[PDB]
Coordinates of C-alpha atoms in Angstrom, one line a residue:
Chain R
X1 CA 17.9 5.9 8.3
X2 CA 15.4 8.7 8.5
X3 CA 16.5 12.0 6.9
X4 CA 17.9 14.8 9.5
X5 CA 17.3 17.6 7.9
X6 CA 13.8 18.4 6.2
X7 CA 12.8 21.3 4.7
X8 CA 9.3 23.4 4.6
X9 CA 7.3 24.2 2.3
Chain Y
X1 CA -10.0 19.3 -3.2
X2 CA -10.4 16.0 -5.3
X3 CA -11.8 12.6 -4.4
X4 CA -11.7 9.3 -4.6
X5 CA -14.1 7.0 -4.1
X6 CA -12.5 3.7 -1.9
X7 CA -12.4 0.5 -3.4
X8 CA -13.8 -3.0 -1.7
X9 CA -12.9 -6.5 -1.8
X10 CA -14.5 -8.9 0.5
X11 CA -12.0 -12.5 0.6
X12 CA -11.1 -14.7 2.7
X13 CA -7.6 -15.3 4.3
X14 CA -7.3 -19.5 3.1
X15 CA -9.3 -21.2 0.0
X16 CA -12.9 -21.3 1.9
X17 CA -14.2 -24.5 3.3
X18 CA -17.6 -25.3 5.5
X19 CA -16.8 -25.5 9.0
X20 CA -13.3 -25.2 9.0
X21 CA -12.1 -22.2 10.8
X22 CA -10.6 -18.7 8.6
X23 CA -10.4 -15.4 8.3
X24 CA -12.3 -12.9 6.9
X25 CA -10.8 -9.9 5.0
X26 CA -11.9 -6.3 3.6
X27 CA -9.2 -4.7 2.1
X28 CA -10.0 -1.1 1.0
X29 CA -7.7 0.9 -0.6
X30 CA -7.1 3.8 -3.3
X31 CA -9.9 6.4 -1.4
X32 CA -8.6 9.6 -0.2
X33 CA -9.2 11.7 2.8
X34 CA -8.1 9.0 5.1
X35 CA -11.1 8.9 7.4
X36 CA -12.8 5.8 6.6
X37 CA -15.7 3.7 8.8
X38 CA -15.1 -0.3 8.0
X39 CA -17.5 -3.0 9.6
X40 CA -17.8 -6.8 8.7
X41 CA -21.3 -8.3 8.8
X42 CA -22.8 -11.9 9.5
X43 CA -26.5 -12.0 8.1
X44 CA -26.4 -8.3 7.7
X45 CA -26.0 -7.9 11.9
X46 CA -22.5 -5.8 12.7
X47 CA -19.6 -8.1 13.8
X48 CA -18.2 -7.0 17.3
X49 CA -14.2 -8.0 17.0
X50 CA -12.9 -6.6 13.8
X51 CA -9.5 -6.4 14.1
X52 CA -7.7 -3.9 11.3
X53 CA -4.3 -3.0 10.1
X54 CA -2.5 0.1 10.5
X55 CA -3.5 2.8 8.1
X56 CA -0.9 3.2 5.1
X57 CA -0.7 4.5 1.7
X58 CA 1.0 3.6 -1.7
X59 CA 3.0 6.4 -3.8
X60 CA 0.1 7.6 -5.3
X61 CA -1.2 9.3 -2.2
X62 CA -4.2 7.2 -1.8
X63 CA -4.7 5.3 1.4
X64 CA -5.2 1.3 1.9
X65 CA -5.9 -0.5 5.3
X66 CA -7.0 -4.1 5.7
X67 CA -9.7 -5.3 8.1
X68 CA -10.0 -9.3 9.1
X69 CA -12.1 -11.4 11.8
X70 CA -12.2 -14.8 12.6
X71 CA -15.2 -16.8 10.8
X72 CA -16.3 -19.6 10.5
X73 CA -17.4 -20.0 6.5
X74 CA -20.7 -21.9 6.1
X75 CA -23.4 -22.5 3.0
X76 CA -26.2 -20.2 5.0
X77 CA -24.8 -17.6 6.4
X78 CA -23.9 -14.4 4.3
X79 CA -21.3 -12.2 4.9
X80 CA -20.4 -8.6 3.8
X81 CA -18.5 -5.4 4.5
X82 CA -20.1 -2.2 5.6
X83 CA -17.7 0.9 4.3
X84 CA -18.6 4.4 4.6
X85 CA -16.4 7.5 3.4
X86 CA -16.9 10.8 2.4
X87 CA -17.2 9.9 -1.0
X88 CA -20.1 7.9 -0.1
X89 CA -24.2 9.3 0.2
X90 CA -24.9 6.3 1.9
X91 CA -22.9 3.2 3.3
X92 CA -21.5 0.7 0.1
X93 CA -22.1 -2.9 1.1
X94 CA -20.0 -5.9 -0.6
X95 CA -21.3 -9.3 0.1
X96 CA -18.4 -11.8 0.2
X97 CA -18.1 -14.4 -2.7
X98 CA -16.7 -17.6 -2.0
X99 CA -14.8 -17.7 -5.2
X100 CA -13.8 -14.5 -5.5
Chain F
X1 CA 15.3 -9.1 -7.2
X2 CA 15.3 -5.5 -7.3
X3 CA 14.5 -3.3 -3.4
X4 CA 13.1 -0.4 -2.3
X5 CA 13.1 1.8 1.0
X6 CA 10.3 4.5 1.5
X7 CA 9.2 6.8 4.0
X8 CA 5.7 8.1 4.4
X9 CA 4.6 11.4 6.1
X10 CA 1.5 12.0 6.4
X11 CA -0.1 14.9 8.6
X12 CA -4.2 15.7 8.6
X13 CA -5.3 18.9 10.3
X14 CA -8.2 18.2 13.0
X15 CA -9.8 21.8 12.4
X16 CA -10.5 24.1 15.8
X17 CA -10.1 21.0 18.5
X18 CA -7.1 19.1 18.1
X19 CA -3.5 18.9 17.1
X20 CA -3.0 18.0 13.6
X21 CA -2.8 13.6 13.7
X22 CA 0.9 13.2 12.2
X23 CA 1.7 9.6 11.1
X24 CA 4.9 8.1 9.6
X25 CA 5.9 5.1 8.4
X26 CA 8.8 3.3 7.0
X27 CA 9.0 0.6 4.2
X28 CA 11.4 -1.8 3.0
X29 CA 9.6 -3.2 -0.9
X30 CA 5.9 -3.8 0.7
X31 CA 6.2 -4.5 4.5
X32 CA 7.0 -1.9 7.3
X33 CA 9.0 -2.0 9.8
X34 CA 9.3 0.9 11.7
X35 CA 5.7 3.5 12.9
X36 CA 5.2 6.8 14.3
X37 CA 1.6 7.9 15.1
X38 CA 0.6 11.2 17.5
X39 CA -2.5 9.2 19.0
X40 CA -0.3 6.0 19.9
X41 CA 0.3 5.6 23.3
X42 CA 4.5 5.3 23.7
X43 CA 5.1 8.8 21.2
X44 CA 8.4 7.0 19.9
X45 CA 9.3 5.7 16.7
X46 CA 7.6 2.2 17.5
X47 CA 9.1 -0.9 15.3
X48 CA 7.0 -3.1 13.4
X49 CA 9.1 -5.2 12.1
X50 CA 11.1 -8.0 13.4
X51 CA 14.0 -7.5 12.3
X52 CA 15.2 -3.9 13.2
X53 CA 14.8 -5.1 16.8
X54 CA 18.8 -6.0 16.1
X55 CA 19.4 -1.3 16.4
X56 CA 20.1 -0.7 19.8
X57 CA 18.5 2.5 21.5
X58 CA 20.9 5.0 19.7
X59 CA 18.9 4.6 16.9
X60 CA 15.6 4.5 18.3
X61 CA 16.3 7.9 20.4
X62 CA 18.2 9.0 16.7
X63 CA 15.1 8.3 15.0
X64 CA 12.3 9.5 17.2
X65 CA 13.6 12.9 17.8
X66 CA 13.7 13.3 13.8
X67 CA 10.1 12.2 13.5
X68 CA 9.4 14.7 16.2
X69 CA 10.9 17.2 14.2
X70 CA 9.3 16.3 10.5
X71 CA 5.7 16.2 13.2
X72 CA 6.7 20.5 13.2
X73 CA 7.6 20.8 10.1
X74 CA 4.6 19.4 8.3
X75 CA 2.5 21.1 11.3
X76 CA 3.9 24.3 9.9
X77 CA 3.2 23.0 6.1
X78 CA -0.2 22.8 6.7
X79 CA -0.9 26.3 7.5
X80 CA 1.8 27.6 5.2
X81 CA -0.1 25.8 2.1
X82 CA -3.2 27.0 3.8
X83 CA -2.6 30.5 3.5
X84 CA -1.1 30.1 0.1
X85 CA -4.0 28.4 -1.4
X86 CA -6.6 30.7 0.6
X87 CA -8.5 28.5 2.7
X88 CA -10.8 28.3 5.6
X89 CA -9.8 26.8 8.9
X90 CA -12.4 25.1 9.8
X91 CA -12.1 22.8 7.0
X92 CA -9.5 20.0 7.5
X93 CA -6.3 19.2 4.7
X94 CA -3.8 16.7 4.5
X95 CA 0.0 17.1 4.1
X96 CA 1.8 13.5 2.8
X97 CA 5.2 13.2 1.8
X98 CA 7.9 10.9 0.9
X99 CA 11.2 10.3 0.0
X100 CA 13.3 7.4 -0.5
X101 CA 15.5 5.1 -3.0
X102 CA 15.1 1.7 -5.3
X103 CA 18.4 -0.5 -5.8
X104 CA 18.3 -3.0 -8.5
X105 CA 19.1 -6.9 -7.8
X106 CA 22.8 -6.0 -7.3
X107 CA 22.0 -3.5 -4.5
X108 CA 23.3 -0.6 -6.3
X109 CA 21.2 2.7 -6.9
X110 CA 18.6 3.1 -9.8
X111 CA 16.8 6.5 -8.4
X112 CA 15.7 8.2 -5.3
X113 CA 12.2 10.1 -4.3
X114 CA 11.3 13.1 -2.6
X115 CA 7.5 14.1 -3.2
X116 CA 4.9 16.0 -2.0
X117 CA 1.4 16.1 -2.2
X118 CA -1.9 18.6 -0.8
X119 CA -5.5 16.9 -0.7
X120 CA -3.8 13.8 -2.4
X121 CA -2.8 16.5 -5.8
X122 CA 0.7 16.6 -6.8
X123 CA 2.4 19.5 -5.1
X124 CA 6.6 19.2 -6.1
X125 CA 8.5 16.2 -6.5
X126 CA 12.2 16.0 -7.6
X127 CA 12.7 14.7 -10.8
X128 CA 14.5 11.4 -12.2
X129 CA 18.3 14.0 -12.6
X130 CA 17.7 14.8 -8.6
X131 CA 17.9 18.5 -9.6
X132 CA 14.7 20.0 -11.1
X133 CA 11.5 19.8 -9.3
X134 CA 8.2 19.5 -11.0
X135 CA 5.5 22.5 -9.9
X136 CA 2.5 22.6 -11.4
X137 CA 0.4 25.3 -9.7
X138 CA 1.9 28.6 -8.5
X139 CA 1.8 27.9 -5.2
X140 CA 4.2 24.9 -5.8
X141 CA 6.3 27.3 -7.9
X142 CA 7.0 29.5 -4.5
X143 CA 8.0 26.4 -3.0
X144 CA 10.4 25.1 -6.4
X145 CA 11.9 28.8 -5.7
X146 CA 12.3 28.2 -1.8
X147 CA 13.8 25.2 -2.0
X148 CA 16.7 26.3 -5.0
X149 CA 17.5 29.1 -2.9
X150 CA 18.2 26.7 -0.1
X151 CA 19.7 24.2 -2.7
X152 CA 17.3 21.5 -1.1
X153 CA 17.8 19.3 -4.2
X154 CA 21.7 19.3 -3.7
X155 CA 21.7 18.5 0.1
X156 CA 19.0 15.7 -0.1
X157 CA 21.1 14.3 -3.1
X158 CA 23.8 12.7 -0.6
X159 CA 20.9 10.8 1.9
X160 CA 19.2 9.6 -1.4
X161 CA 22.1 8.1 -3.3
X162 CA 24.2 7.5 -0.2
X163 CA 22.6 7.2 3.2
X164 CA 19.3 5.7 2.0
X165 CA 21.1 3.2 0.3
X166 CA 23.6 2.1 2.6
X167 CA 20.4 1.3 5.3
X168 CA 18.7 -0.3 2.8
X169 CA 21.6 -3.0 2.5
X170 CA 22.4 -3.0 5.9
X171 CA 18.1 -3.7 6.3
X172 CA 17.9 -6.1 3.6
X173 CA 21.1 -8.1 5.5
X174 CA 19.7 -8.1 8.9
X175 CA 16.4 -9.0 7.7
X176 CA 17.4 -11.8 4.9
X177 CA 15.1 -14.1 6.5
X178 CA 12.5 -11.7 5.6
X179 CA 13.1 -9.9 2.7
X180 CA 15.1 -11.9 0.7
X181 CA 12.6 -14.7 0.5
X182 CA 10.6 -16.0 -2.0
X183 CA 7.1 -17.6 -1.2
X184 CA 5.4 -19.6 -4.6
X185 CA 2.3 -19.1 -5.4
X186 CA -0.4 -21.9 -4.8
X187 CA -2.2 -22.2 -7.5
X188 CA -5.5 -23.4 -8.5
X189 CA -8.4 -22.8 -10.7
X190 CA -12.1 -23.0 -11.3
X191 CA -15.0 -22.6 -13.8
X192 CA -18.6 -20.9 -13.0
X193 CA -21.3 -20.7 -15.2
X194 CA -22.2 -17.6 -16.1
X195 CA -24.7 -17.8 -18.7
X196 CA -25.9 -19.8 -21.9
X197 CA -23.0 -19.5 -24.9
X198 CA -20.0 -18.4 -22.3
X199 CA -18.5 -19.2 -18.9
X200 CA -15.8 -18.1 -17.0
X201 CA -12.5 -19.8 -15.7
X202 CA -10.7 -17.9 -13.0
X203 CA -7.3 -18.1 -12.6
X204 CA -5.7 -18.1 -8.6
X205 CA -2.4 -17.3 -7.3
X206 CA -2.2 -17.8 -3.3
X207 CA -0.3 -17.3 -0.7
X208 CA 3.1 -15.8 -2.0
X209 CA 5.7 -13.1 -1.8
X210 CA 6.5 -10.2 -3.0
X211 CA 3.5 -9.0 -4.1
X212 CA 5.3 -9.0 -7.7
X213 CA 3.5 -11.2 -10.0
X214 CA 2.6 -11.7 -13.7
X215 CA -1.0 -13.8 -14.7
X216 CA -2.1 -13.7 -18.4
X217 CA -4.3 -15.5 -20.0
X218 CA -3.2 -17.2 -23.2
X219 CA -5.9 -19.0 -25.9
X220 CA -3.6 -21.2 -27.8
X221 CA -1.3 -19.5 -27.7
X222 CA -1.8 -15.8 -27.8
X223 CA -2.3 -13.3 -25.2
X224 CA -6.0 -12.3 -24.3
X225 CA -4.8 -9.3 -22.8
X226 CA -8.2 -7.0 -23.6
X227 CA -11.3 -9.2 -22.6
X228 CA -9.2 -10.3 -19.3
X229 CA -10.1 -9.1 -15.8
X230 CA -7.3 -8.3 -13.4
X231 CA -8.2 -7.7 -9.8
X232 CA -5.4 -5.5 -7.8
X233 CA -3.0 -7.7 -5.9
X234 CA -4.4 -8.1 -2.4
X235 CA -2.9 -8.8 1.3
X236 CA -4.0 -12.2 2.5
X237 CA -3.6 -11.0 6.0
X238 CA -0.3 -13.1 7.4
X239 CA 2.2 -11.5 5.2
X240 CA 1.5 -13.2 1.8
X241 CA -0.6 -12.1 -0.8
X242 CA -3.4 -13.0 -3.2
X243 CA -4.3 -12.4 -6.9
X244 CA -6.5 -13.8 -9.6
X245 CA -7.4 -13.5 -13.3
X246 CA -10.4 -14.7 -15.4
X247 CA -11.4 -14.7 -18.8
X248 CA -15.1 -15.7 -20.2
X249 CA -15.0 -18.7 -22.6
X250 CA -17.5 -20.2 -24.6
X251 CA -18.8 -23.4 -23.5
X252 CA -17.0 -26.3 -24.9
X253 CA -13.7 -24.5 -25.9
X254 CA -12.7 -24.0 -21.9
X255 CA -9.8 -26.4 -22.4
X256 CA -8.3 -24.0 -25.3
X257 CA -7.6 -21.7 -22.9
X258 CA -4.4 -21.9 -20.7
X259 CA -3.6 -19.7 -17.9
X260 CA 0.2 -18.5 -17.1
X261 CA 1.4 -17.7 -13.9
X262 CA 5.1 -15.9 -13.5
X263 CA 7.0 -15.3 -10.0
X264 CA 10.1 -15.5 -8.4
X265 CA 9.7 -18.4 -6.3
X266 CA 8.8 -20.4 -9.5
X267 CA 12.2 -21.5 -11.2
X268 CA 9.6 -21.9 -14.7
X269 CA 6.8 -20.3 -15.1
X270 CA 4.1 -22.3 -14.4
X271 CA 0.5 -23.0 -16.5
X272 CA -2.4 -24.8 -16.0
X273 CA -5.8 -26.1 -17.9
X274 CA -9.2 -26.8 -17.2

């Protein structure tokens, strides 16, 4: 349900 | 940085009746940072068990939490909520309304 | 009606002592059901809602090693946007984020999120096409740039209108008991005095769910949609919520106004008279 892949800023 | 100050309301859980037992809510929301002091009062003296929700926040990046004890409404006795933020010089009290 | 499922990131830097506090939560329309928090004692993706309690531990060892990893990634945000914006350390900032996706009544996709914000300021969020962000300040314009290079937009684009949805339903069936319900309003209302030539009649609407609900006041028979106060709908504290409106009248004409109250566990709208 929670996203795998998150991205910086 | 940019602020807002946190907005109070001071209800009760059911439609408030003498003697019968209830709960007492202050719901603040819409502030921002997150760091927030909450107390409930009886006659202006600092209620002991608040209990309080867990901190959350709507889309709009502000922050809301809701803070309840059990009471006991009567026609003497005043109630309030004590709120304190960064926003705030000095503590913002809200006495509760019965109707409101 | 329609449903929603959001997640909420939120990380605060404790300047000097103290790792920054990284919370996040997950929503399904208004309640939550699952909690991460740095300060909690178990340091797992803790539920708080009933009905998830069906996912065995696949998906709570799943989901708590992702938190873990958005806890870095927002731990590195924080001094990433601090040294673009030029800041002190010893002053604390906040990080929130949040992505998710709203389905109409039929359960099929309307749009997704994925938004991000410094001090409580818009930073970038994607736009309605789920292709262009929206920077406002140059240091979100590094970002917008960071993030096409990595085609961000494009690889998010298959969680938002594909694996956010398909929980969503599967949440919405497991929890039907919950989230599918419809609680009416009990309504009620009363008149106080509030001075010579006027008083007020305040219209209540207790104890119902969602938090979706229409109150205007109507003065035979148009809308008094100025002069009409409109407190924010509030949690009652045991799931349901409150709400009221109120109008001041001038004495004697009290009964020419009409209060109308509109909600989904009311097959007709409902109105009511002093």
């Amino acid at each position: 349900s929670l996203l795998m892949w998150i991205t910086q800023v | 940085m940019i602020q807002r100050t946190p907005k109070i309301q001071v209800y009760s859980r059911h439609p408030a009746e003498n003697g019968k037992s209830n709960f007492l809510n202050c719901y603040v929301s819409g502030f921002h940072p997150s760091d927030i002091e909450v107390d409930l009062l009886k006659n202006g003296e600092r209620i002991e068990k608040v209990e309080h929700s867990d901190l959350s926040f709507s889309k709009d990046w502000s922050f809301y939490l809701l803070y309840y004890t059990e009471f006991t409404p009567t026609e003497k006795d005043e109630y309030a909520c004590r709120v304190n933020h960064v926003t705030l010089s000095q503590p913002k009290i809200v006495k509760w309304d019965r109707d409101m | 009606g329609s449903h929603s499922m959001r997640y909420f990131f939120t990380s605060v830097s404790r300047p000097g002592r103290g790792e920054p506090r990284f919370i996040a939560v997950g929503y399904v329309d208004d309640t939550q059901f699952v909690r991460f928090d740095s300060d909690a004692a178990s340091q797992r993706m803790e539920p708080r809602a009933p009905w998830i309690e069906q996912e065995g531990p696949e998906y709570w060892d799943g989901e708590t090693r992702k938190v873990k990893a958005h806890s870095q990634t927002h731990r590195v945000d924080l001094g990433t946007l601090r040294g673009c914006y030029n800041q002190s350390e010893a002053g604390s900032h906040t990080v929130q984020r949040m992505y998710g996706c709203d389905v109409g009544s039929d359960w099929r996709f309307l749009r997704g999120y994925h938004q991000y914000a410094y001090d409580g300021k818009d930073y970038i969020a994607l736009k309605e096409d789920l292709r262009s962000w929206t920077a406002a300040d140059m240091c979100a314009q590094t970002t917008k740039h960071k993030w096409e290079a990595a085609h961000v937009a494009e690889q998010l684009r298959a969680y938002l209108e594909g694996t956010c949805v398909e929980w969503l339903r599967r949440y919405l069936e497991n929890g039907k008991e919950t989230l599918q319900r419809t609680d009416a309003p009990k309504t009620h209302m009363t008149h106080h005095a509030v001075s010579d030539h006027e008083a007020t009649l305040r219209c209540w609407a207790l104890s119902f769910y969602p938090a979706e609900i229409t109150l205007t006041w109507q003065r035979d028979g148009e809308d008094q949609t100025q002069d009409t106060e409109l407190v924010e709908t509030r949690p009652a504290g045991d799931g349901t919520f409150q709400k009221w409106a109120a109008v001041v009248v001038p004495s004697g004409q009290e009964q020419r106004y009409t209060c109308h109250v509109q909600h989904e566990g009311l097959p007709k709208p409902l109105t009511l008279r002093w």
